[PDB]
Amino acid sequence: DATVYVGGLDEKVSEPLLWELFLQAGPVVNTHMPKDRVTGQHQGYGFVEFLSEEDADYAIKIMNMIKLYGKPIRVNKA
Amino acid sequence: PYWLYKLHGLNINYNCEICGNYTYRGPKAFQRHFAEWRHAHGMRCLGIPNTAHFANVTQIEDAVSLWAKL
Amino acid sequence: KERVAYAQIDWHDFVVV
Amino acid sequence: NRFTVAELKQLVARPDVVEMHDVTAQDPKLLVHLKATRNSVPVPRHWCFKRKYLQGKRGIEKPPFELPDFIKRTGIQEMREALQEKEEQKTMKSKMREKVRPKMGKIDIDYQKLHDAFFKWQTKPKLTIHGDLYYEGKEFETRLKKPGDLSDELRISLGMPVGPNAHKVPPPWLIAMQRYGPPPSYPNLKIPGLNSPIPESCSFGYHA
Amino acid sequence: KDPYFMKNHLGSYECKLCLTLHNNEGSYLAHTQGKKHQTNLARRVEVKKFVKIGRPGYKVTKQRDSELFQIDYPEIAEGIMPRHRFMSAYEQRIEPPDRRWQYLLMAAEPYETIAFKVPSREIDKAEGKFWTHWNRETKQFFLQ
RNA sequence: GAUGUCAUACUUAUC
Known part of the structure; x- marks a missing residue:
């Protein structure tokens, strides 16, 4: 309930960059970025787990108009 | 290979009673999965926060006693 | 063809009569 | 004879320094008292490996x-x-x-x-300090941010010019913060245009 | 041309396929032939510019219905139907003040766009395939 | 990762 899924991100975005983007709406406790170890590239999706479910819902509700590298990033509940 | 599984401590059955008595095929793999999302989701059902004191906690009663002692 | 024609028309020439 | 990690964590005043390998030593209480001291230094992580801390960066x-x-x-x-x-x-x-x-x-x-x-x-x-030890992955771990501030790389990736006027210098997620309210995880967060003056708070965020 | 042998920062040779080190140059050429090296090798714009704009005088007739507008257009002699779209008053050629309403504008290729302002928030639907019609036999455009 | 044969290279102002 406290984890939100972020999609639509480019492969050039990094995990500290995603943490600094997510910290503008609330402190994130953890950030997981699934990436293939064979090629070393991201899959374009991530999971941001905050300290509470209401803060995660407020972060997912306020990230519906975010654009990174020309691509709109979508936030959903997970 | 059997050499890479015998030298790295693999193919050793370990039981984790916190995450529904799951199986782990390594001590280092269990130590890496203890600070992960699955162990955090297993510990969040009992009400224990994800901290450094419950890193080596396996039983649910020992984790409940460590959460009640603090 | 209708989607190509609708995405190429001028949407700034507004006339209220 | 050798107790488990739960009794060693419950008996010691600092259960965060208790490890899994310290329960099978010759003195668990003395090791728990030495590991939780004020000026003590932890042991390196290469003592339990098998590469002798020199076969990783080949x-x-x-x-x-x-x-x-x-x-x-x-x-x-x-x-x-x-x-x-x-x-x-x-x-x-x-x-x-x-x-x-x-x-x-x-x-x-x-x-x-x-x-x-x-x-x-x-x-x-x-x-650096004397307590900060060196490891194999310490030279590559450079990731170790603040609410209300944005770096140059994040502003170049998101396309948000940082200026003194608060019209376009806040991100376009501030409209949701104006329609819904302040974030509940930071009550002391002050954003310009909603709860802060626009020409005064030109940093697009203040933690007061 | 071996893509696995590289030079390190100490004047040695490094094989990244099997992750091996070699001091002299004669040990790197002899490390390619073997069991571990063989195992590592086996394991691894035009429509917008051509549109004529003469801007004729349109004839729209609105009517308050209850459960609709009729635009009389001439013969276009084409299969492209006139499309309606709802836009905001924030974008304009001169940008007048106090513009905070919406306008539904219908546009065609040989004719000019006719726009009607809607002060209400939502009273109908401005979709093209949902509640619009264009009779080409009588050349009558309707949208409700 | 260990083992046992061969080769290369390095260090202690060694002779």
């Missing part, structure tokens, strides 16, 4: 040398590179003829410039 690329500014501000590195480029093209006969009648004055830059760079232009290096 195929990884590494720079040869990182010269400081005081050594590069004297022109000795460019002269050494020019001498290495001139000496690599010489054959064995050119190296044997330069040993009987050598040519003096290789670079001959200055004599007080090195003393001025080592005494007047001396810069203090970036040291």
Whole structure:
């Protein structure tokens, strides 16, 4: 309930960059970025787990108009 | 290979009673999965926060006693 | 063809009569 | 005889320093008291490995040398590179003829410039504390941000010019913060345009 | 041309396929032939510019219905239907003040766009395939 | 990762 899924991100975005983007709406406790170890590239999706479910819902509700590298990033509940 | 599984401590059955008595095929793999999302989701059902004191906690009663002692 | 024609028309020439 | 980790965590006042390998030692209470001291240093992580902390960076690329500014501000590195480029093209006969009648004055830059760079232009290096140990992955872990502030790389990736006017300098997620309210995880967060003055708070965020 | 042998920062040779080190040059050429090296090798714009704009005088007739506008357009002699779209008043050629309403504009290729302002928030739907019609036999455009 | 044969290279102002 406290984890939100972020999609639509480019492969050039990094995990500290995603943490600094997510910290503008609330402190994130953890950030997981699934990436293939064979090629070393991201899959374009991530999971941001905050300290509470209401803060995660407020972060997912306020990230519906975010654009990174020309691509709109979508936030959903997970 | 059997050499890479015998030298790295693999193919050793370990039981984790916190995450529904799951199986782990390594001590280092269990130590890496203890600070992960699955162990955090297993510990969040009992009400224990994800901290450094419950890193080596396996039983649910020992984790409940460590959460009640603090 | 209708989607190509609708995405190429001028949407700034507004006339209220 | 050897107790488990739960009894060692419950008996010691600091259960965060208790590990899984300390329960099978000869003194769990003494190890828990020494590991949770004020000025104690932890053990390195290479004591339980099998590569002796030197077989990890085998195929990884590494720079040869990182010269400081005081050594590069004297022109000795460019002269050494020019001498290495001139000496690599010489054959064995050119190296044997330069040993009987050598040519003096290789670079001959200055004599007080090195003393001025080592005494007047001396810069203090970036040291660290005695408790911060070194590991194999410490040279690559450089990720170790603040609410209300944005870096130059994040503003270049998101396309948000940081300016003194609060019209476009806040991100376009501030409309949702105006329609829904302040974030519940930060009650002391002040954003310009909603709860802060726009020409005063030009940093697009304040933690007060 | 071996893509696995590289030079390190200590004057040695490094094989990244099997992750091996070699001091001299004669040990790197002899490390390619073997069991571990063989195991590592086996394991690894035009429509917008051509549109004529003469801007004729349109004839729209609105009517308050209850459960609709009729635009009389001439013969276009083409299969492209006139499209309606709802836009905001924030974008304009001169940008007048106090513009905070929406406008539904219908546009065609040989004719000019006719726009009607809607002060209400939502009273109908401005979709093209949902509640619009264009009779080409009588050349009558309707949208409700 | 260990083992046993061969080769290369390095260090202690060793002789």
